[PDB]
Amino acid sequence: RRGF
Amino acid sequence: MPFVNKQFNYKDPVNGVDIAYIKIPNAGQMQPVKAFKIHNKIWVIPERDTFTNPEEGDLNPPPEAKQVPVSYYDSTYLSTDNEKDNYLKGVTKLFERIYSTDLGRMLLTSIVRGIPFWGGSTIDTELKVIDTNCINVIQPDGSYRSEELNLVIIGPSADIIQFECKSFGHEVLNLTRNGYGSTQYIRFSPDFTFGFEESLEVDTNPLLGAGKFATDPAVTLAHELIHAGHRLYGIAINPNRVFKVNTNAYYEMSGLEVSFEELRTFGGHDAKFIDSLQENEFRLYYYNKFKDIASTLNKAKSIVGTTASLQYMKNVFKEKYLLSEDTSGKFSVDKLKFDKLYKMLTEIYTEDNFVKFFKVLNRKTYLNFDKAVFKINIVPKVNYTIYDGFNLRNTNLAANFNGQNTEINNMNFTKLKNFTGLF
Ligand SMILES: [Zn+2]
């Protein structure tokens, strides 16, 4: 996942 | 030499072998979807993912007053044959770019060898495949045949920018964390990318920057493939194990937590936020898990099905887990070999290392704030290549990461949404  | 030996076109007629209508083991039901097998054990489904999760089957964007920060909706994306053709070609090109590097070749090889373990039977003296690690392929005669696979690349669900690695769970076995492994479905799109800032102080600040530089999508896919690698070898870190970020005042004031699995995947300095003690804990944990698999393989002597023999599968997993065999025929996990494999999957295969291989500009840490999302088209060679990505050699985009500079190479990026200030 890319995240924030 | 190429990873994908065929130049698939979405409209190519189905053949029931590598171009076919298939169904996935989502426990729910669906109409068959056209899929393409681009390499041994790897398939691509050019469809929005409304299948792996029955509850996430609605692409329509909720009311504007109910949307969050970092998110992008477009219910129409990937609904036409032209888009699907472009999606297929974009994903294929990224696999080639990744495979063109020694690190990528190593990662992809590990993924292909990472066949999910055959442990779905109750008789410990019987090896059986877990059907959720398979897909049902419609054969030329219209009948369904089960095929094992390791990886599936599929389009995103409702939130287009929420890329992720997901897999079907087991009633009791935690497949992605017990050394077994499971088929990985990566929600991903080569048609969009994210903007980040060149200054660390700006990139890690939620109120600054418009996203001057674009992330190379090959890095983004590699990031997901690294997760897939961890999950295929059943050594992913439980998502509840997180790092309460105390190195960024903005994360802190919001109590934001980042999973160790993400820190591991990014690598570089981020990986250091996982202290030695807990790091040793995980390593020992997975070591035992590999031991349990070694013994299950010893007790196992009979096999289910007739597609492959027992001697074949035993060797398949001896190869995957790099186990050792004594004069008798008993398998055991070698301390040195386990650490080498574990380290390869967790420290060698990292986002930070892929950045070094691709020679691209990229976020310096996972602990930052996205700035924007751009629409892109990497299929045309005049836009992006397997060898240089956006930074085309012998052009004005060759140096200083000019190709990734959205201001200089403006024709290759259309900003769809700004995230800065929305946090
Ligand atoms: Zn991630």
Q: In this complex, do B163 and A4 lie within 8 Å of one another by their Cβ atoms?
A: no
Structural tokens at position B209: 């920057």
B230 is in an annotated binding site: no
Q: Which of B164, B227, B369 sits opposite A4 (nearest CB)?
A: B369
B224 tagged catalytic: yes
The H or E element that residue B286 is part of is helix B276-299
Give the whole-angstrom CA distance, residue B264 versus residue B360: 20
Give the whole-angstrom CA distance, residue B104 versus residue B102: 5
Chain A residues near residue B369 by CB distance under 8 angstroms: 4
Closest CA to B190 of B417, B380, B394, B399: B380
Give the whole-angstrom CA distance, residue B301 versus residue B35: 35
Centre a 10 Å sphere on the Cβ of residue B25 and count the other Cβ atoms it contains.
Answer: 17
Give the whole-angstrom CA distance, residue B123 versus residue B105: 37
Give the whole-angstrom CA distance, residue B288 versus residue B224: 26
Closest CA to B10 of B86, B108, B116: B86
Give the whole-angstrom CA distance, residue B112 versus residue B93: 18
Q: In this complex, do A3 and B223 lie within 8 Å of one another by their Cβ atoms?
A: no
Residues in chain B: 423
Q: CB–CB of B230/B342 below 8 Å?
A: no
Residue B157 has φ and ψ, to the nearest 5°, of -85, -145
CA distance A3 to chain B (A): 7
Q: CB–CB of B78/B155 below 8 Å?
A: yes
Q: Which of B96, B197, B224, B351 is catalytic?
A: B224
B33: buried, middle or exposed (CB in 10 Å: 19+, 13-18, 0-12)? middle
- Reported as half-sphere exposure (CB side, CA atoms, 13 A), residue B298 has a value of 16
Q: In this complex, do A3 and B366 lie within 8 Å of one another by their Cβ atoms?
A: yes
Give the whole-angstrom CA distance, residue B10 versus residue B356: 33
**Helix, strand, coil fractions of chain A, as percent rounded to 5:** 0, 0, 100
Give the whole-angstrom CA distance, residue B271 versus residue B37: 34
Q: Facing residues of B325 across strands?
A: B331
- CA B145 to chain CA centroid, Å, is 25
Q: In this complex, do A2 and B223 lie within 8 Å of one another by their Cβ atoms?
A: yes
Structural tokens at position B100: 């063109």
> Domain B1-423: what homologous superfamily?
Metalloproteases ("zincins"), catalytic domain like (3.90.1240.10)
Residue with tokens 């990937």: B78
What is the bridge-based pairing of β-strands B257-259 and B242-244? antiparallel
Phi-psi group of B209: left, alpha or beta (phi > 0 → left; psi -120 to 50 → alpha; rest → beta): left
Give the whole-angstrom CA distance, residue A2 versus residue B131: 29
B171 is in an annotated binding site: no
Q: Which amino acid is at B331?
A: F
Q: In this complex, do B161 and A2 lie within 8 Å of one another by their Cβ atoms?
A: yes
Instruction: Compare all CA atoms of chain B with the CA of A2 and give the residue at the minimum distance.
Output: B163
- C-alpha of residue A3 to centroid of ligand 1, in Å: 7
Chain A residues near residue B270 by CB distance under 8 angstroms: none
Instruction: Compare all CA atoms of chain A with the CA of B262 and give the residue at the minimum distance.
Output: A1
Chain B residues near residue A2 by CB distance under 8 angstroms: 161-163, 194, 220, 223, 370
Give the whole-angstrom CA distance, residue B317 versus residue B315: 5
Interface residue B162 vs chain A (CB under 8 A): yes
B279 is in an annotated binding site: no
Residue with tokens 């800065």: B420
Residue B77 DSSP SS3: coil
